[PDB]
Design an enzyme around this catalytic site. Structure first.
Site, PDB file in Angstrom:
ATOM      1  N   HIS A  94       0.802  -1.233   0.000  1.00 24.31           N
ATOM      2  CA  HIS A  94       0.000   0.000   0.000  1.00 24.31           C
ATOM      3  C   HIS A  94       0.833   1.281   0.000  1.00 24.31           C
ATOM      4  O   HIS A  94       0.294   2.382  -0.152  1.00 24.31           O
ATOM      5  CB  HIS A  94      -1.053  -0.035   1.114  1.00 24.31           C
ATOM      6  CG  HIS A  94      -2.185  -0.975   0.822  1.00 24.31           C
ATOM      7  ND1 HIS A  94      -3.287  -0.600   0.073  1.00 24.31           N
ATOM      8  CD2 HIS A  94      -2.393  -2.273   1.164  1.00 24.31           C
ATOM      9  CE1 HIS A  94      -4.122  -1.629  -0.027  1.00 24.31           C
ATOM     10  NE2 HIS A  94      -3.605  -2.648   0.624  1.00 24.31           N
ATOM     11  N   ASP A 113       0.134   3.007  -3.227  1.00 22.49           N
ATOM     12  CA  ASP A 113      -1.216   3.484  -3.557  1.00 22.49           C
ATOM     13  C   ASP A 113      -1.158   4.934  -4.034  1.00 22.49           C
ATOM     14  O   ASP A 113      -2.031   5.375  -4.764  1.00 22.49           O
ATOM     15  CB  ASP A 113      -2.139   3.439  -2.339  1.00 22.49           C
ATOM     16  CG  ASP A 113      -2.466   2.056  -1.925  1.00 22.49           C
ATOM     17  OD1 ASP A 113      -2.144   1.110  -2.664  1.00 22.49           O
ATOM     18  OD2 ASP A 113      -3.082   1.904  -0.850  1.00 22.49           O
ATOM     19  N   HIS A 164       1.135  -7.869   5.832  1.00 20.84           N
ATOM     20  CA  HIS A 164       0.329  -8.075   4.639  1.00 20.84           C
ATOM     21  C   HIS A 164      -0.907  -8.950   4.774  1.00 20.84           C
ATOM     22  O   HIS A 164      -2.011  -8.513   4.467  1.00 20.84           O
ATOM     23  CB  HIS A 164       1.216  -8.609   3.485  1.00 20.84           C
ATOM     24  CG  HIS A 164       0.532  -8.603   2.153  1.00 20.84           C
ATOM     25  ND1 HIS A 164      -0.131  -7.507   1.659  1.00 20.84           N
ATOM     26  CD2 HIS A 164       0.380  -9.582   1.225  1.00 20.84           C
ATOM     27  CE1 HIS A 164      -0.669  -7.801   0.488  1.00 20.84           C
ATOM     28  NE2 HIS A 164      -0.373  -9.057   0.205  1.00 20.84           N
ATOM     29  N   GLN A 172      -2.235  -9.751   7.379  1.00 20.50           N
ATOM     30  CA  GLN A 172      -2.957  -9.182   8.522  1.00 20.50           C
ATOM     31  C   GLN A 172      -3.542 -10.227   9.483  1.00 20.50           C
ATOM     32  O   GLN A 172      -4.777 -10.393   9.594  1.00 20.50           O
ATOM     33  CB  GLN A 172      -4.044  -8.206   8.021  1.00 20.50           C
ATOM     34  CG  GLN A 172      -3.377  -6.977   7.431  1.00 20.50           C
ATOM     35  CD  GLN A 172      -4.307  -5.899   6.828  1.00 20.50           C
ATOM     36  OE1 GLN A 172      -3.991  -5.375   5.780  1.00 20.50           O
ATOM     37  NE2 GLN A 172      -5.399  -5.544   7.500  1.00 20.50           N
TER      38      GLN A 172
HETATM   39 ZN   LIG Z   1      -2.100  -4.391   4.747  1.00 16.98          ZN
HETATM   40 ZN   LIG Z   2      -0.177  -5.384   2.255  1.00 11.59          ZN
END
Ligand SMILES: [Zn+2]
Ligand SMILES: [Zn+2]
EC number: 3.6.1.45
Length: 515
Positions: free
Chosen positions: A92, A95, A227, A229
């Site tokens: 991210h 992003d 990642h 999570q």
């Molecule tokens: Zn994440």
């Molecule tokens: Zn991630």
């Protein structure tokens, strides 16, 4: 290092912060409480004569409006004050344009690391592969690695002259580079790759477990991950606990002599791995996940006061982000119908707009969501983020699944069985058919009949993908990707780049019908 000397080293870690610099509505987490906790552990360890290293598995960006709207500046500055030593670059972190990531690097007083992200044209790394830290007279190397699915997922936008090489292969090269040049006493890898039970990464890029198995046994003291999570706390060999409970024991994974840890997401926990190093051997003596004011609302563990210095640092960003919610982000020439007695009975323009935003973010061919997931309309006129959040108030995450034409048929036939006048009634986009006696006739995706031999990408929310409203589960099938993008952010960003919106573009024309 001294011979026969025993060094105590405590490694603290967090990951997938995703814009959560502030405590949530129930007083959970936030960086002000994190600061108090980390300061406390540093005091404890300093008094015991040990050392502390605080690492992040990455993904600081994206996930909370107040953070997103300010490019995560409060999060990076907050991390400076908590005192992070280094961070692995997450997917991210891409992003936003590279200009924003370089700006974040300027804000951060700790290195943002990644050994496997390369500039294509020159074959040179974009970031530093590692950072070295002196603790007592030990040389500790922290390498960074970023998942190579980063530029492949969803609808990629900013990877001009950039490529992500395989993390595990790069780790082999990097460990060897370090041993031959720095000979660090300890090497830890901060990674943004994902922990999958027994290395069962499926369609995802190989993660931490497969990498640990590929490296020389014990070549790394530990892999501080992210990642996927998850709080990496094992129930059985090669099997993470499901529904891990805050405050209970947490046994990290150990693969090929390498410890693999992860502290879930959003600053919910600060993982603490206590090691003892002596004459070259690194022994983990204790491990735990320390909740940061998590509540079930009652606390699981002792309340952690919010550090005042952090509150004063972060408050202006919180306040500015909240005020920005009022600001016009777009406009519409017609009312977007999100009323309950419309979205639970028929396809509406709000349904089409939301699904158009989700398909655009994910590169999907069609999409679906529950009418019960649309919580408000938006009147003709100016639209603010605040308006968007009332339509999408629950923070569902946009996800997608690549599936065979046959799977699409089975999937849509099942979903079409959800009756009007229920929250489960489906809103579709790019799907057309006439349903008759449980069957879908003349089924089409983007105006073309479905081909069982083709692959289609479908967007929806995590709520639906994991079985919400009786929808077929997609989360446990290959090809599934949880993007981490919040429903409201996806709608707000789409409306913002698409305004002025001509709503006639989102008006259903009988594509799907039941009879
Ligand atoms: Zn994440
Ligand atoms: Zn991630």
């Amino acid at each position: 290092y001294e011979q026969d000397k025993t060094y105590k080293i405590t490694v603290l870690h967090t990951n997938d912060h995703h814009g959560h610099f502030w405590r949530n509505e129930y007083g959970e987490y936030g960086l002000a409480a994190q600061k108090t906790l980390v300061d406390g552990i540093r005091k404890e360890v300093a008094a015991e004569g040990g050392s502390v290293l605080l690492l992040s598995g990455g993904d600081i960006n994206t996930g909370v409006p107040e953070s997103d709207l300010q490019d995560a500046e409060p999060d990076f500055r907050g991390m400076n004050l908590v005192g992070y030593d280094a961070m692995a670059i997450g997917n991210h972190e891409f992003d936003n344009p590279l200009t924003v990531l370089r700006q974040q690097e300027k804000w951060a007083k700790f290195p943002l690391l990644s050994a496997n992200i390369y500039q294509k044209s020159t074959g040179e790394r974009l970031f530093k592969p590692w950072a070295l830290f002196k603790r007592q007279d030990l040389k500790i190397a922290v390498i960074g690695l970023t998942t190579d699915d980063t530029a492949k997922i969803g609808n990629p936008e900013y990877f001009t002259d950039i490529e992500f090489r395989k993390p595990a292969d790069e780790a082999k090269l990097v460990i060897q580079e370090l041993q031959q040049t720095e000979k660090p006493d300890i090497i830890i890898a901060a990674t943004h790759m994902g922990h999958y039970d027994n290395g069962e990464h499926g369609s995802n890029a190989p993660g931490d477990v497969e990498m640990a198995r590929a490296l020389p046994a014990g070549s790394l003291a530990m892999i501080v991950g992210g990642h996927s999570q998850d709080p990496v706390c094992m129930a059985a060999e090669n099997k993470k606990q499901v529904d891990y409970v805050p405050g209970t024991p947490c046994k990290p994974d150990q693969q090929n002599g390498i410890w693999i840890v992860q502290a879930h997401e959003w600053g919910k926990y600060v993982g603490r791995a206590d090691f003892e190093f002596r004459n070259g051997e690194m022994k983990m003596v204790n491990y735990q996940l320390i909740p940061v004011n998590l509540k079930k609302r009652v606390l699981y563990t002792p309340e952690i006061a919010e550090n005042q210095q952090m509150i004063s640092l972060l408050s202006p960003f919180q306040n500015k982000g909240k005020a920005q919610l009022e600001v016009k982000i777009g406009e519409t020439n017609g009312r977007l119908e999100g009323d309950r007695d419309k979205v639970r009975f028929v396809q509406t323009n709000m349904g089409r707009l939301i699904l158009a935003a989700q398909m655009d973010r994910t590169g999907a061919d069609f999409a679906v969501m529950s009418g019960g997931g649309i919580r408000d309309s938006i009147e003709a006129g100016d639209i603010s983020y605040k308006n968007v959040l009332k339509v999408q108030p629950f923070g569902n995450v946009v996800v997608y699944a690549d599936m065979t034409g046959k799977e699409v048929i089975d999937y849509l036939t099942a979903v079409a069985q959800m009756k009007p006048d229920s929250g489960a009634y489906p809103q579709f986009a790019n799907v057309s058919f006439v349903a008759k006696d449980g069957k879908l006739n003349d089924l089409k995706i983007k105006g073309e009949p479905v081909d069982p031999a083709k692959t289609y990408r479908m967007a929806t929310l995590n709520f639906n993908a994991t079985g919400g409203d009786g929808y077929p589960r997609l989360d446990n099938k290959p090809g599934y990707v949880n993007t981490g993008f919040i429903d409201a952010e996806v709608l707000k960003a789409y409306i913002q780049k698409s305004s002025p919106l001509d709503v006639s573009v989102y008006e259903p024309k009988g594509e799907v019908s039941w009879q």
